């Protein structure tokens, strides 16, 4: 109801160049099933993530479980049941770039969803099977939820 | 000239009737003369000419497939032959069965179902058990595809090295085809790779052919892992599949394989000796870039220590007797090998200091393999030969080093030199890259000298004959290496070696050296060898 | 070849119409060929000004000075009008031209 | 879902590609597994085929989740008189069981008879000089020596007047490397 | 030259590159005073960048508050490297370094001279060109008011612990300089020896001069890049 995507993932490398930021960092994680790679800009400080951590993350482009379709406000005195009681770390954004292997004769088989977090970038590369509910400029949230 | 048209005309002169103004228009078609003869004579005619040799018979039977292409007919090619007879394609593919059903399935393929049956029948019927198919695709028929692999395989198995090279394209390109082909030749690979009598070049053309399969886009890494035992410990091989479908290292991956080893209960090293593995390992850790944050980086070594140092004695599909008690000292080797190649130094002030160390360190063969990579991507990055010392021997004399000390890292460094002396290195001047060839001959004698010639020499002669490099640079290799050997000769090498001495600039080779006589003398003892 | 290969709009191909284009003005453009013509013509248009452009700047470089900032507005335009890119677009060539 | 057969020869029914396509483990959920084990003898050999090599692609985790399922696809693929099915299904029949795949392959078909009968001798005749494996460039001499047997010697094709100049190299760098390392 | 002159000054401009950072969280408290000196805000509090853990703004959220109506520009920042358009990368920085702002709202980037400074092409430029010219006064107003009251929050500074390097920078220093004036001195000690030959063109003076001249700028420059790889990204210097 309003998810665009729902995949588990594992954490496989921490920003692997260097650390460019204290603060934020960035994961080079793949999908459990779906052969996806996500890069994602996560606060290390309010929600450490370590390596070889498997978390699901779910697009949802809206939290409330009846598909309301918000306009974008802060509102924290709804009490309307959302779905960020589930997860632990909610992080809200726009898709600002959908490239893709294309060609001008036939269609795209490998997307590449470009987010971001306010300033935390993410890139989910995935399969167009998978990636279809994403559209240019559109506000998304995160949904990620670390597991043992 | 109609006469060549008996049979059509038959029926419809018997059986006329009616109006046969067009079945005498049609009996009346052939206006020329005997042209039918008249073309056989045209060879005749080219006998005053050029020549009309069998390739003039060559030459006509190639008008007619150029004519034969346009209809080439599929249409009733599946009722011509469900009609149970013709001998046509029969007596096609005994005398003319060279490439005429061979392009004519490699044109369309889908329709002529039963021209193609009959064709590929046929090329079973040929001895050699596959090279007239007319298709590198004939993987599709499991009775066909099996004894075409039996053939190739027993082709290559007597081959040996250095056919190594020649036919295991020619071989792969049909396992490659289809992917359940190459289950069925993995599953054929690990059957035959059971026996410890000889399964070792099975293994090893098993191991080329998931090679070729990674080069071409396969993820094949799944395929060898469900093949090897390394499955009956699952999570470690699921860590493996992963890893080896991404083609990348992962820190958190090789923690989890650290934690499963260094144990008292280690998976079978047969897990670890994939040589795929090894190679992301080498990719990994001696870049000359791509640093590796100094954690995790003593389990990357001893993760490599313990694959390229145990021993293990399988009494009956148990182990008994394991040692670690030298991959200690390959830690160390390997461990030092990195921290030179993370330091970088500038221009070696340390890397020519350490080099006694690292003399020492490349005595074993992963840290001589682990180096020589390291060199292929120091010295192949373009416009590095901007540092000179005598034209920048120092990574070449670590290649000495590794010619030296093993024997099974020839292949490698050969191919490396032979793709330095292919690339033209622009910035440089003439004679500076004159010179720097020389060098790289310099290093090909020094291989030539432990007992790896015969590819050197043949890489000689293809670079003489076929895109002709440097007369000049072959005088200097026969005058390097006729100034350092002499009295045997084993006839492989003399055999190799005549053509291209006695051939093409005799002269060159004899100027000024006097005490100890030129070519001649290798002369003299190739006429007392062979038998004139 | 560059040149031909990114200004030409080469109609001839099906499929790159149909990702391109809807379907009407597909067939617009594949059956009617003044269309055609007209599109050649505005090719034409373009070598010639690619011919004056390389009289005008012997020196290879593009970075002039001109009032409308061309790129920037037709981004705008996306912008606002909530493009979606992948999806065929639904201008007539001949109303551009 | 309806219709399954059809969705499975549609997903994987492109004939002209042969290898196990990506993202099979999203196409292979245990509903859809379900739903194939009633529909299994319908769809084509070439579609099967996929669907065989496919089902190793999953997870460890799926595959024992659900390994009955598998078990059934398998003993339904074992009975079908395609020799590629057939010999799959005798391969694949170990993989959701154990985790490792079958290596006794050698019932109810002539052609594993033959091959490996003719590769064994073949394979018996040919230890002289064999090709060493790819593993062979890294471990060290005595690893060496337990795997494989000890050093092949090269062909002595001459006999070495003197040592190339490389041997004079290697000496002054050696010379030039203790006299930086005392600086 | 067809550009703007007003440009963000100094402080503002340190103030509002460290305000547009990746790793910059604002606490609702410090959203609410920050918003609070926005002339140009609807009165409607934007959705956090983190929601579950600490409802966190970013800077970057209340920057594109800033930013007027609704603008496109694609800049790079000062430190951007040129190796990063080639590989990957080129639409996910890494480093944070490729300015987009789109729709109005600043998508990612960090805000160098060469996003708001006087550089055609600009933040500034084009915010003039596209809107009006009220609403530029407008932008540099809230830009000037809100991101020196972050400053103030934040702090920034510069003293005698951002120009000191670490004893192995020294140590490499020293042995530049060293290296250096040894290479002078035997330069020095070829020229009066005659074994220095004259560049064609010149006398042997020059010859001699251009080489000292030569050998001491490679110095100056290979110690200044050797000094400035060791600012560990908090000193100042670095951060103006």
Known sequence: AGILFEDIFDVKDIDPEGKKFDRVSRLHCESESFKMDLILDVNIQIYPVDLGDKFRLVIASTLYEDGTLDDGEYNPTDDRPSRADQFEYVMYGKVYRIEGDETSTEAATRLSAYVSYGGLLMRLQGDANNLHGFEVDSRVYLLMKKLA | IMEPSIFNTLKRYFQAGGSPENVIQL???????????????????????????????????????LLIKHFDPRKADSIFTEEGETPAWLEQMIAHTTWRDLFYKLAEAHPDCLMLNFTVKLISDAGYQGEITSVSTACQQLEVFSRVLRTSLATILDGGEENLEKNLPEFAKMVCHGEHTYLFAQAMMSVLAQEEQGGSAVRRIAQEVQRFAQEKGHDASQITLALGTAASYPRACQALGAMLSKGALNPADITVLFKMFTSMDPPPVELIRVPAFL????QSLFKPGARINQDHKHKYIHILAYAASVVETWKKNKRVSINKDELKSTSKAVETVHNLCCNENKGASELVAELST????????????????????????????????????????????????????????????????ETEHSQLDVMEQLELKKTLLDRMVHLLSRGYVLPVVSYIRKCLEKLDTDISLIRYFVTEVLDVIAPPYTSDFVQLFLPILENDSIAGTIKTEGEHDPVTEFIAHCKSNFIM | KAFEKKFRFDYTNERA??????????????????????????????????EVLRVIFPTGDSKVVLPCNLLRMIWNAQKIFHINPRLPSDLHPIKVV | ESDTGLWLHNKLGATDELWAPPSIASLLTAAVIDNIRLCFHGLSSAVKLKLLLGTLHLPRRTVDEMKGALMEIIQLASL???????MVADILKSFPDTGSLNLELEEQNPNVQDILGELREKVGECEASAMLPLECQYLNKNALTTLAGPLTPPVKHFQLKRKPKSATLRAELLQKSTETAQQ | SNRPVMGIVQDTLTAVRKFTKRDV?????????????????????PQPAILKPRPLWTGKQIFSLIIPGHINCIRTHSTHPDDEDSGPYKHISPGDTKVVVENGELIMGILCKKSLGTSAGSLVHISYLEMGHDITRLFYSNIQTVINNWLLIEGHTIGIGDSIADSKTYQDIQNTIKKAKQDVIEVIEKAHNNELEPTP?????????????????????????????????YNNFKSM
């Open chain 2, 27 to 65: 009996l009346s078609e052939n206006y020329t003369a005997v042209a039918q003869t008249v073309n056989l004579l045209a060879e005749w005619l080219i006998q005053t000419g050029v020549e009309p040799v069998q390739v003039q018979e060559t030459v006509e039977n190639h008008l007619k497939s």
């Open chain 2, 279 to 282: 190679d992301l390992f080498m």
């Open chain 2, 358 to 421: 690292l003399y020492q360190c490349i005595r074993f063969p992963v840290v001589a393999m682990g180096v020589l990579k390291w060199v292929d991507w120091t010295v192949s990055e373009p416009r590095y030969f901007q540092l000179q010392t005598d034209h920048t021997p120092v990574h070449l004399a670590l290649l000495d080093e590794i010619s030296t000390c093993h024997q099974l890292l020839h292949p490698q460094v050969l191919q490396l030199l032979v793709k330095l002396f």
């Open chain 3, 17 to 50: 119409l149909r990702r391109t284009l809807q379907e009407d003005l597909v067939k617009d453009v594949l059956s009617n060929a003044h269309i055609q013509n007209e599109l050649e013509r505005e090719f034409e248009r373009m070598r010639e000004d690619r």
């Open chain 4, 80 to 86: 079908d008189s395609d020799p590629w099915v057939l």
């Open chain 5, 25 to 45: 969280f604002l606490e609702r408290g410090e959203v609410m005073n920050l918003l609070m000196f926005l002339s140009t805000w609807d009165g409607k509090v």
């Open chain 5, 201 to 233: 063109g010149n006398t042997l003076r020059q010859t001699f001069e251009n080489q000292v001249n030569r050998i001491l700028n490679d110095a100056r420059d290979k110690t200044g890049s050797s000094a400035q790889k060791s600012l560990s990204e």
